[PDB]
Structures are given as C-alpha cells and as structure tokens.
Structure 1
Amino acid sequence: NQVPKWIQLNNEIMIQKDGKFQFDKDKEAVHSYFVDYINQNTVFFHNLKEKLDYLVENQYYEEEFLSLYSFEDIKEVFKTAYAKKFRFPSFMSAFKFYNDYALKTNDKKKILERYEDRISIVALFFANGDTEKAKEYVNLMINQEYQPSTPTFLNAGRKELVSCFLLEVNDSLNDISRAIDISMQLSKLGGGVSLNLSKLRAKGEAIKDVENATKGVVGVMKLLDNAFRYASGAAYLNIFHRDINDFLDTKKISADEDVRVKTLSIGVVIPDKFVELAREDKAAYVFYPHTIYKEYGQHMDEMDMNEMYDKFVDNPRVKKEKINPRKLLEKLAMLRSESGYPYIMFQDNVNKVHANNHISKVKFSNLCSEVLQASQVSSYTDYDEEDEIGLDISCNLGSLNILNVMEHKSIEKTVKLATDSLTHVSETTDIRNAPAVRRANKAMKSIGLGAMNLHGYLAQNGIAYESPEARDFANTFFMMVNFYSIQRSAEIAKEKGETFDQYEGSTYATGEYFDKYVSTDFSPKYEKIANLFEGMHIPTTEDWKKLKAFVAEHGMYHSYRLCIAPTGSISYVQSSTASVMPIMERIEERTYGNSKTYYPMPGLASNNWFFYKEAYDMDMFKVVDMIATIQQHIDQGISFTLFLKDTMTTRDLNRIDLYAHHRGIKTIYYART
C-alpha cells in the first residue's frame, strides 16, 4: 500500500525551502524512475539480429519496408540513435511515453520498444531508400527539433494513420444512409470525423408529396448521436436557417431527454451580412433552403449572402422568417457563458484571404477547428445507379519545437525534411470505404505543418507575453517559415513536374498571394529581437521576387501547407508548453491513482516567475493581436482558445468577439473558466 520512491520524491517539490520549490529533487525522482520500474520490465535480448527476428515472427512489424535495406545500415542507424546518450528532463517526460505511446506486449504487461527504438523505426519509415536521409531524420528527431503527429507517431509499422476527416451530406435518404455508413467506417479507424448539415431541408416541410412532413435536423442529430456511441466528432451549420434555435437548444444545462447530445459538438457559420444586421439593429430573415433549391436550382450557402439577401427578401417564392439578431448574439453569449459551446467560424475573413476560392468557398471546419479547404458534395444515387464523386478533406498533421530551432539555426533543413516526411505519409495513405476521400487525397495532396513552444521560449528568454517585441518576433519568424515552406514546395514541384489540379485557377499561379511580399518588408524592429535571429541569413523582398519568378517557372506541389493544432497530448513528450496559447497554471496537478503527480512547467526558476504569467490575468486584445500577427502567414485556421473568468462579462465577451471579427481571426475554440 506504500507509495513508491519516485512518486514520493515528486511530491517533495511543494515543500517550501526558503519560500521556494524543490526543483533539484525532480531529476532525482526521474533517476528513481529509471531504476525501480522501467529497467525491471524490459524484455532482455542479446543483440540486434535475434531481437528483430523475434519481432517479426509474432506479428508486430510490417516486414516489407523492414526488408528493404541491409542489416548493417539499420545497425548504423540504431548506433547513431544510441550515440546521443539521451536523457529526459522532467518526470512526466517519461511517464506519458512509457505508459501509453510506447509499444507494449500482447499481455500488456511488458515493454519492448525503448525510446531510441520508436524514433528510429519512424526514421526508417520516413526513409524509403536512403540510409543517410534516415540518419538525417534521426538527427532531426533526437534533438527534439521536430515532432510528427499523434497517429503517425503511434502506428508506424504495426497493425488508420490520419486523424482528421471532413465530409458533406447531400440531401436524400440514400445520402443519409451513405453518411452514417462512412461515419461508422471511419469510427473504428479512430480519426476525427465531423459532418455538416447545410443542404438539408428543415422541419415541418414537404417531402415530395405532402406538406409538413419533415422531422428536421434534430432527428438526424439524434441518429448521429446514437451512431457514434457504437464505436466522437461534431457538426457545423450555417446560421441562415429556421431551426438554428433548435440547433442551439441541444447544448442545454436543463437538457431534455430526447434533445440530448453528449457526443457531438456543434458550431455556427456566420458571414458579414448577419454581423451588419446585428450591429445596425434591424430585422433578420432565416429561410427554407429547399424552396431556394426549387427556385434557383443551386443550394443556399453556395452564393453570397451580401449579394443575394435582399433579393431573397424580395422574392415571394422563398418563404422566410423574421428574427432578432441582437437577441440571438445575446443568447450565444449566454450559451457560451454556460459552457463555451458552440464553435464559431467567420467565413468572410477566410475566403477573402483564401488562395483556392476558384474551386469553392470554405463552408465549415473539422473537429480540431483548424482546416479550411475546399469541399465539393457528392451525390449518392440508388443501388444499380452510379454515383457522382465530390471532394473531401483529410489532413494529416505535425508541428515542431521553436526552441531547438533557435538553438541550432537549421530551420531551413528542418522544413526540408518535414515536408518530405508528410509528403511520404500522404503517399502512403489509402482508405477503401469512402471513395471521395480517396479521390481527394490522391488529388489535393494537402499537408499540414505547425509549431508548439511559443510561450515558454520567449518567457524563458525574458520577454513578456503582451510585448510588441514578441509580435514583431513572431511576424519575422513565421514570415521566414512560410518563405522556406513555399521554397521547398516549389523545389518538390520542380522535382516532379506535376502540380495539383487546377493550379492555374489558383492565385498562386498569378502571384496574387505574392503581392503582399513584393513590398512591406518584415525586418526586425527591435534590437533585442534582432540579436535572437543574429547569426543567420534573413531574406529580402527581392528574394521574394526571385521566389515569385521561380514559382512562375513551374508552380507549387501542394495546395495547403500549414495548420495549428492544440497538440497537448504530444506536448509532454517534447517536454515543452502547448502551442501559441499561453499556459493556464504554473503547476499542473494530476491524480493517476492514490497519487499526487506535480508537474512544473519547464524552465520554472525564481527569476522567470513573472514571465510565466497566468492565463486568467492577461489582456485578451493583445492576445488577439498576437494571433492576428500570426495569421499574416497561415493559410488555414489557428487553434485560438478563449480564457475566461466567472467575474467577466458577456458584454466584454461579445466585445472581444466583434474585436476578433474586426481584426480577422478565422475561428475560435471552446472557452475555459
């Protein structure tokens, strides 16, 4: 019943020694943890050869790519991995990896893969042919300079791989059947699956023969809520719809028995016209979209609300409904004061900066509220009848440490390797049950790259989080990031000579995206910021012009490059902070079982106590301006999370909302208190 030694040592840090914390004990706890639990459950082997032979003959490793080299080259790779003599810096830095991510045995009671093992297996998977490139991946990963995404880091060479799926539901019975089918298919693959209910007819409407026959959106939500309980995502909705009130009555603290969704989140799509009507204090008109489909032939949100709203008001054909926008934003503020639900996307900020609006305009987002790409709906006909295949969105992920990049200045080569890595991942991927995801993943070739460790590095260097210097720093940094990113994409496009489809329809072929960079140079405006990037080259606008010419030579290989995800579950292995959202508390406290695990933030010393500010004690406006400065280079959304208090006000909340709409923040997240 006694608590073991390392947990007891980890509980020692809260003892006040001269008003401080016992940080130096922490390593000792880690030095306990590698003696009394880890090195007494590892399966023992003589050497490498039999080890790998035992790993093959019990159905663990996919033996194909592990047969495509010599034994000696793999031995050199493992030798390069063990030559680091790597150590962990913190207590959770081991515990989150040797409990869940690292490979266990069949009885789930022993440990096979060491920390070099998993990384070097990932390295040979990203190699696909070159030994020295695999060594480059090792030197990239073992210095904690790059982190692949969660399911890629889990399921490399075992018994799918991308945790993000985005679909559309056309309007038929057959379409709803196909949608529930594909959701149950992807549900066992563990990824993130979110739907959208734009083009559906509303409640109390005619079904092809008889008026007032449709049970509406709530029944489809009920079927999906039962559907994900069998094997957890969300769904979005554009606001110009009668049942939007019933779409928002689901998340309710006085929850109805039938109106009860504990699985799916919800979210609202809002263009500028509704914002205008809520500002100027006038009426609003939600519609019956099936009447619009009968009238104009198209669907509702496939046209501009700013161009067509009063025209639908003027049509006697479209049955309408008048409501109050201001009371509706008040109700949104109340429901976000309850929890923070739903989600919010401002599409006009997105499409006016989007490159690929010539295919379609972005209407929705994933569960992770980040990926904003084109989406064409399919049409699933009857059994012997053939179908028509639209386009879908499937985004594999991956971020990186800012800190070690700043330590080593190999940021270019870092992007060079990570781009090829995610490229080979999207090469490898195949799903054999949803054909539109198949066609789009072959077609669009969308990769997603981001970064964590913003708060901690700049807080450890002694720069406040609300400083303008950090905003200029992030501006110059992400400018150079996007520069080398497009540079590598153009290089690979020259290597293959095969861009994505309808490349001339993009703004990339015209250089309209490049028109921001031909002027308005992003040189550092502070000396202390300039000392940080001091020691390496920073490009000029003429380098952007040479880049524009080199793009105009061939083109770009990818259609999307960047994403920012709240990668907290693999934040702990990199032993760092979250992404760009600053930290909540200086000390995290968990109870694994009969235990009080005490996690300090990395870099917690006496001097930098003030730069480790608290999330409840910050200027939200400067945070939004930081995220807007970050937004200057990112194609997709940014995982912006609101940090609130009970003492705050929905007046101030909606002021922050309209402030972010005025700045141009794409999406937000669930709010915390």
Structure 2
Amino acid sequence: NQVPKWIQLNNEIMIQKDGKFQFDKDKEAVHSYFVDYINQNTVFFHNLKEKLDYLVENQYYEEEFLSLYSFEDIKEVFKTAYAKKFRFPSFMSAFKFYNDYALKTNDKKKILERYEDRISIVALFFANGDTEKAKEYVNLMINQEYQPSTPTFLNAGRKLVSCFLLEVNDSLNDISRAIDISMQLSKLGGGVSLNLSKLRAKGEAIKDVENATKGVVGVMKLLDNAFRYADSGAAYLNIFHRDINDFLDTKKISADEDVRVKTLSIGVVIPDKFVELAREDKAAYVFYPHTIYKEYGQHMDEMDMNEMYDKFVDNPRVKKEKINPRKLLEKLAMLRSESGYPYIMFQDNVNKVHANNHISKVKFSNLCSEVLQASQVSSYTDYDEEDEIGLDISCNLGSLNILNVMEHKSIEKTVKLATDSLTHVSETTDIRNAPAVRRANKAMKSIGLGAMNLHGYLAQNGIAYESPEARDFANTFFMMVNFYSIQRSAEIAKEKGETFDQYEGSTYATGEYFDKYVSTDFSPKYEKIANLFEGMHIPTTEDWKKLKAFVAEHGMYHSYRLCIAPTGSISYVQSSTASVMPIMERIEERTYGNSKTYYPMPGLASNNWFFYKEAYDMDMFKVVDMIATIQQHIDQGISFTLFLKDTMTTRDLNRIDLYAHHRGIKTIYYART
C-alpha cells in the first residue's frame, strides 16, 4: 500500500525551497522509476532475431513492410535509434509513453516495445523500403522535431484518421445510409461530423400530405441514441432556418427527456448576411429550405444569402419567418457564457480566402474545428435502385515542434520528410463502407500540417506571449514554412508529374495566393526575432515569385496542406508544451491514482516565470491579432480555443465576435472559464 519512491519524489517537487520548487526531484522520479519499474517489467530476449521472431509469431505486426528490409538494415536503424540513448527529462514523458502509447503484451502485464522501438518501426513504415530515409525519420522523431498523429504513431503496421466530414440529403434512404456510415466509422475511432443544412423544417408536408414532418430534432435524437452503441460525433446547421432556435434547444441548459444530447456538438455557421441583419438591428427572415428547393430548385445553402435574401423576401412562394437577430445574438452569447456552445463559423470570411471556391463554399467543419474544404452532398435511393457518390472531407494530422525546428534549423528537410510521410499515410488509408470519402481522399490528396510549443519556446527565449515581436515571429516563421510547404507540394506535383483534381480553378494555378506574397515581404522587423531567424536564409518576395513561376510551371499536389488541432495529448511524450494557444498554469497538477503528480511546464524557472503567464490573465484581443497573423499563411482553419473566465459578460463576448468578424477569423472553439 506504500507509495513508491518516484511518486514521493514527484511530491517533493512542490516543496517550497526558498519560494521555489524542487524541479530536479522530477529526474530521480524519472530515474528511479526507470530502475524500479521499467527495467524490471520488460520481457527478456537473447538477441534481436528471436525478438522479431516473437513479434512475428505472436501476431503483433504487419510483416510485409517489415520484410521490405534486411535484418541487418533493421539492426542498423535500431542501432541508430539506440545510439541516441534518449534521456527522458519529464515524469510524464515515460509516464504516458510506456503507460499508454507503447505496445504491451496480450495480458498487458509487461513491456514489449521500447521508446526506440516504436519510433523505429514507425520510421520503417513511413519510409517503406528505404533505410536512410527511415533514419532521417528517426532523427526528425528521436530529437522530437516532429510527432505524427495519435493513430498514425500508434498503429503503424498493427491490428487511422480522426477527421471525417459528410453531408445529408433530403430522403429517408439517405438518412438510413448516413446512419449506417456513421455506425461504420464509429467502431474505427475516427472523428465524424456533419451538417444538416439540406433537410426540411419541422411541420412541413412530406410530399403528399400537409403538416407531416416531425422535424430535424427527432433525427438529432436518433443520432444521439445511435452514438450510444460505440465508444463521438457532431452536426451543424445553416443559420437561416426556422428550426435554428430549435438548434439552440439542443444544448439546452435544462436537459430534457424530449431533447437529451450527450455526444453531438453543435455549431452555427454564420454568413455575413446574418451579422448584417443583426448589425442594423432590423428584423430578419429565415425560410423553409424545402420550399426553396421546390421553388428555385436548390437548397438555401446552395446560394448566397446576401444576394438572394431580398429575392426570397419578395417571392411569396417560400414561406417566411421573421425574428430579431439581435435577440438570437444575445441568446448565442448567453449559451456561450453558460458553456461555450455552439461553434461560430464565418463562412463568407472562409470563402474570402478559399482557393477552391470554384468547387463550392465551405459551410461546416469538424469536431476538431479546423478543417475547411469543399464538399458535395450525395444522394442514396433504394437498394435495388442506383445511388450517387458525392464529395467528402478527410484530413490527416501530425504536428511538429517550433522549439526543435528553430534550434536544429533543418526546416526545409523537415517539410520534406513530413510531407512524404503524410503522403504515405494518405496513400495507404482506405475506406470500404462509404465510397464517397474514398473517392474524396483519392481525388483531393489533401493533408494537414500543424505545430506546437509556441508559448513555451518563445517564452523560454525570454519573449512575452503578448508581444508584437511574437506576432512578427509567427508571421515570418509561418511565411517560411508556407514557402517550404508550397515548394514541396510543387516539387511533389512535378516529381509525380500530376496534381490534385480541379487544380486549375484554384488560386494556385492562377498564382493568386502568391499575389499576396510576390509583394509584402514578411522579413522580421524586430531584432531578437530576426536573431532567432539568423543562421538561415529568410525567403523574400522574389523567392515567392520563383515559387509562383514553379507552381505555374507544374502545379501543386495538395489542395490543402495545413491545419491546427489541439494536439495536447502528445506534448508530455514530446517533453514540450501545448500548441500555439498559451499555457494556463505553470504547474499542471494531476491525481493519477492514489497519488498527486505535479508536472511543471518544461523549462519553468523564475526567469521565464512571468513569461509563462496565465491564460485567465491575458488580453484576448492580442491573441486574436496573433491568430489573424498566423491565418495570413494558413489555408484552412485553426482551432482557437477561447480562454475566458466566469466574471466576464456577454456583451464583451459580442465585441469579441465583432472583432473576430472584423479580423476575418474563420472559426472559434468552445470557451474557457
């Protein structure tokens, strides 16, 4: 029943040594725990050969790509990994890896993989034939310069994507098909979310008899019950609906029998017409999209509301409903101050930067609230009858370290290796239930790249998070990685000799995304910011001009390359801080079980004490200015989590919303307290 030594060492960290903390007690809490637990619970082997034979015979890996190398090359990459002798600085480093991310035994009572082993296997999977590229993947990974996504780093050749975005058409067979597809993907752990802007409203005529539609809320109840059969999902709605108030009745603070959501996150996508109508404080008009489909031929989200609003107003066919949009703004701010629900997307601001607007307009995002692509709704008829194959969205993840890239300065080769690995993931992944997402991943070849450790690295350098220096740092750095990513995508579309589909209507084929970058040089205007960027060439606008000429020469390979997700589940094993969102506490405190670990921030001392600020005590306006500074280079959206408190008010949240709509911010996340 006795607490072991390393847990007591972690308890000893919080002992006030002259007003500070016993940080080095972590290390023994590392070092004893390696000795007393890790090295005493590992399965013994006599060599590498019998170890690999045990891995083969005990049915733990796909043996094919493992047999794409010799045993000597496998031992070479293993010796290369073990030549690091990686010394974990954090208790949570080993305390999450060998606890969760490491592949253990079948009874899960001993250790199988080491920290080098999983990384080397993932490197052999990413390289898939080459030994030296796998060693480069190791050097990108064993120095923690890159970290792949959670199922990607988890089940590389074992027994894959957490981003899925679909639509729904207005037929019962479509409803059953979508229910089936969500149940198919729910067992695979992928993040599946949708949007319901193409369904008929409550109390409408179902094709023969008047006043027959039970409403969308029954379908939401059905999907909420359907998600109770697996381990989660989400759905959206365009704002100009009569049941949009009922869309606010979903996440009601009085949890009803008739409305009881537990899994489906909601998010209201607001075009500029609604903030236009609420800004003038004039009464607005939502409509019936089935009457719109019966009158004009298309759904309401098929057309822009700013054009066709008065065209719906004067036309007597589509039935009206008149409300106050300012009261809806008040109730939205009220629900956001209650919880932080729902999400808000400025889809016109998304299309204001969207390169593939020639295909469609983005009208929704994921649960991770980051991916913004084009889409097409399918249509499913009966079983004997033939159906349709629309367009879908699937964007893989995987982050890098700002700190390790900025210290090791292999940034272009980092872009090379990360792009090749994400290309390999997009190539290998296949879906055999809904062929629409299969066709979409086959057609778009879309990837998503992000990064972490912004506040911890820059605050570790002695730079405030609320500095314009850090904003210019993000500006120049993401200009450089934008240069390298577009350079790599154009090189890859050259080397393949082939680009993604509908590349010609995008801004890359016309060079319009580079039109911002052929002028307006984002060279560092601050001295410490430039000195951090010293040691490497900063690409100017002429480099962007040659990049534009090379893109117009061949083409670009990925319709999207970048997304930013809250990838906080891997910061501990990356021995690093979170993503570009600033930290909340200098010391995380957890009760693991029968214990209290006290994990401080990595690099926490008294010099960066006030550089490691608190998220409850920051100006959010400088944060969204930084968000816009980063969004100057990101194609897709960024999951900006709002860091708020309980004492704030709804009208200041409204001012934040007007400020973000003024900044052209794409999406927002659930708020803090």
Provide the rounded CA distance (Å) in 2 between the counterparts of 1:265 and 1:426. Answer: 27
For each residue in 1:360-394, what CA deviation from the matched residue of structure 2 results, as whole angstroms up to 9, or x when unmatched?
11010011000000000111011111111100001
User: How far apart are 1:17 and its partner, in Å?
Assistant: 1.1
User: How far apart are 1:649 and its partner, in Å?
Assistant: 1.1
Partner SS state of residue 387, structure 1: coil
Q: Does the 8 A contact of 2:201 with 2:213 survive in 1?
A: yes
Matches within 5 A, 1:16-415: 16-159=16-159, 161-231=160-230, 232-415=232-415
User: How far apart are 1:346 and its partner, in Å?
Assistant: 0.7
Provide the rounded CA distance (Å) in 2 between the counterparts of 1:117 and 1:253. Answer: 48
User: How far apart are 1:252 and its partner, in Å?
Assistant: 1.9
Counterpart for residue 473 of structure 2: 473
Provide the rounded CA distance (Å) in 1 between the counterparts of 2:55 and 2:193. Answer: 37
Partner SS state of residue 54, structure 1: helix
Q: Does the 8 A contact of 2:104 with 2:111 survive in 1?
A: yes
For each residue in 1:115-151, what CA deviation from the matched residue of structure 2 results, as whole angstroms up to 9, or x when unmatched?
0000000000011111111111111111111010111
User: How far apart are 1:302 and its partner, in Å?
Assistant: 1.0
Provide the rounded CA distance (Å) in 2 between the counterparts of 1:24 and 1:501. Answer: 54
Q: Does the 8 A contact of 2:168 with 2:377 survive in 1?
A: yes
Partner SS state of residue 513, structure 1: helix
Partner SS state of residue 285, structure 2: strand
Provide the rounded CA distance (Å) in 1 between the counterparts of 2:19 and 2:547. Answer: 56
Partner SS state of residue 551, structure 1: helix
Partner SS state of residue 629, structure 1: helix
Provide the rounded CA distance (Å) in 2 between the counterparts of 1:246 and 1:571. Answer: 39
Instruction: Say which is worse superposed, 42-51 or 500-509, in terms of deviation.
Output: 500-509
- The gaps in structure 2 that reach 5 residues or longer are none
Provide the rounded CA distance (Å) in 2 between the counterparts of 1:299 and 1:42. Answer: 60
Provide the rounded CA distance (Å) in 1 between the counterparts of 2:50 and 2:24. Answer: 41
TM-score by length of 1: 0.99
For each residue in 1:437-466, what CA deviation from the matched residue of structure 2 results, as whole angstroms up to 9, or x when unmatched?
111111110011010000001101111111
For each residue in 1:79-136, what CA deviation from the matched residue of structure 2 results, as whole angstroms up to 9, or x when unmatched?
0000011111111111111111110111111110000000000000011111111111
Q: Does the 8 A contact of 2:395 with 2:446 survive in 1?
A: yes
Partner SS state of residue 336, structure 1: helix
User: How far apart are 1:21 and its partner, in Å?
Assistant: 0.5
Q: Does the 8 A contact of 2:65 with 2:129 survive in 1?
A: no
Provide the rounded CA distance (Å) in 2 between the counterparts of 1:655 and 1:284. Answer: 21
Provide the rounded CA distance (Å) in 2 between the counterparts of 1:540 and 1:592. Answer: 49
Provide the rounded CA distance (Å) in 2 between the counterparts of 1:569 and 1:142. Answer: 18
User: How far apart are 1:513 and its partner, in Å?
Assistant: 1.0
Q: CA RMSD in A?
A: 0.8
Provide the rounded CA distance (Å) in 2 between the counterparts of 1:606 and 1:504. Answer: 54
Provide the rounded CA distance (Å) in 2 between the counterparts of 1:195 and 1:529. Answer: 41
Provide the rounded CA distance (Å) in 1 between the counterparts of 2:464 and 2:595. Answer: 34
Q: Does the 8 A contact of 2:616 with 2:644 survive in 1?
A: yes
Matches within 5 A, 1:539-618: 539-618=539-618
User: How far apart are 1:643 and its partner, in Å?
Assistant: 0.9
Partner SS state of residue 512, structure 2: coil
For each residue in 1:506-559, what CA deviation from the matched residue of structure 2 results, as whole angstroms up to 9, or x when unmatched?
111111111101111111111111111111111121111111111111101111
For each residue in 1:597-647, what CA deviation from the matched residue of structure 2 results, as whole angstroms up to 9, or x when unmatched?
111001111111111110010011000100000000000001101111111
For each residue in 1:189-214, what CA deviation from the matched residue of structure 2 results, as whole angstroms up to 9, or x when unmatched?
01101111110001000001111111
Provide the rounded CA distance (Å) in 2 between the counterparts of 1:139 and 1:569. Answer: 22
User: How far apart are 1:299 and its partner, in Å?
Assistant: 1.1
Partner SS state of residue 63, structure 2: coil
Provide the rounded CA distance (Å) in 2 between the counterparts of 1:254 and 1:384. Answer: 44
Provide the rounded CA distance (Å) in 1 between the counterparts of 2:571 and 2:528. Answer: 28
User: How far apart are 1:585 and its partner, in Å?
Assistant: 1.2
Provide the rounded CA distance (Å) in 2 between the counterparts of 1:552 and 1:14. Answer: 58
Aligned-residue sequence identity (percent) comes to 100
For each residue in 1:301-353, what CA deviation from the matched residue of structure 2 results, as whole angstroms up to 9, or x when unmatched?
11111110011001000101000011111001111111111111110110010
Provide the rounded CA distance (Å) in 2 between the counterparts of 1:439 and 1:7. Answer: 51
Partner SS state of residue 176, structure 2: helix
User: How far apart are 1:26 and its partner, in Å?
Assistant: 1.2
Provide the rounded CA distance (Å) in 2 between the counterparts of 1:26 and 1:504. Answer: 55
Partner SS state of residue 234, structure 1: strand
Instruction: Say which is worse superposed, 175-184 or 587-596, in terms of deviation.
Output: 587-596
User: How far apart are 1:272 and its partner, in Å?
Assistant: 0.5
Provide the rounded CA distance (Å) in 2 between the counterparts of 1:104 and 1:85. Answer: 21
For each residue in 1:272-317, what CA deviation from the matched residue of structure 2 results, as whole angstroms up to 9, or x when unmatched?
0110111111001011100000011111111111110011001000
Partner SS state of residue 193, structure 2: strand
Provide the rounded CA distance (Å) in 1 between the counterparts of 2:50 and 2:502. Answer: 52
User: How far apart are 1:253 and its partner, in Å?
Assistant: 2.2
Provide the rounded CA distance (Å) in 1 between the counterparts of 2:366 and 2:17. Answer: 48
Provide the rounded CA distance (Å) in 1 between the counterparts of 2:17 and 2:507. Answer: 61
Instruction: Say which is worse superposed, 627-636 or 241-250, in terms of deviation.
Output: 241-250
Instruction: Say which is worse superposed, 415-424 or 647-656, in terms of deviation.
Output: 647-656
Provide the rounded CA distance (Å) in 1 between the counterparts of 2:620 and 2:184. Answer: 41
User: How far apart are 1:398 and its partner, in Å?
Assistant: 0.8
For each residue in 1:474-520, what CA deviation from the matched residue of structure 2 results, as whole angstroms up to 9, or x when unmatched?
10000000000000001111101111112111111111111101111
Provide the rounded CA distance (Å) in 2 between the counterparts of 1:503 and 1:254. Answer: 48
Q: Does the 8 A contact of 2:90 with 2:572 survive in 1?
A: no
Structure 1: which 4+ aligned runs deviate by more than 6 Å? Answer: none
Provide the rounded CA distance (Å) in 2 between the counterparts of 1:652 and 1:545. Answer: 42
Provide the rounded CA distance (Å) in 1 between the counterparts of 2:7 and 2:276. Answer: 57
Provide the rounded CA distance (Å) in 2 between the counterparts of 1:529 and 1:63. Answer: 48
Instruction: Say which is worse superposed, 70-79 or 584-593, in terms of deviation.
Output: 584-593
Partner SS state of residue 651, structure 1: helix
Partner SS state of residue 294, structure 1: helix
User: How far apart are 1:241 and its partner, in Å?
Assistant: 0.3
Q: Does the 8 A contact of 2:344 with 2:668 survive in 1?
A: yes
Counterpart for residue 509 of structure 2: 509
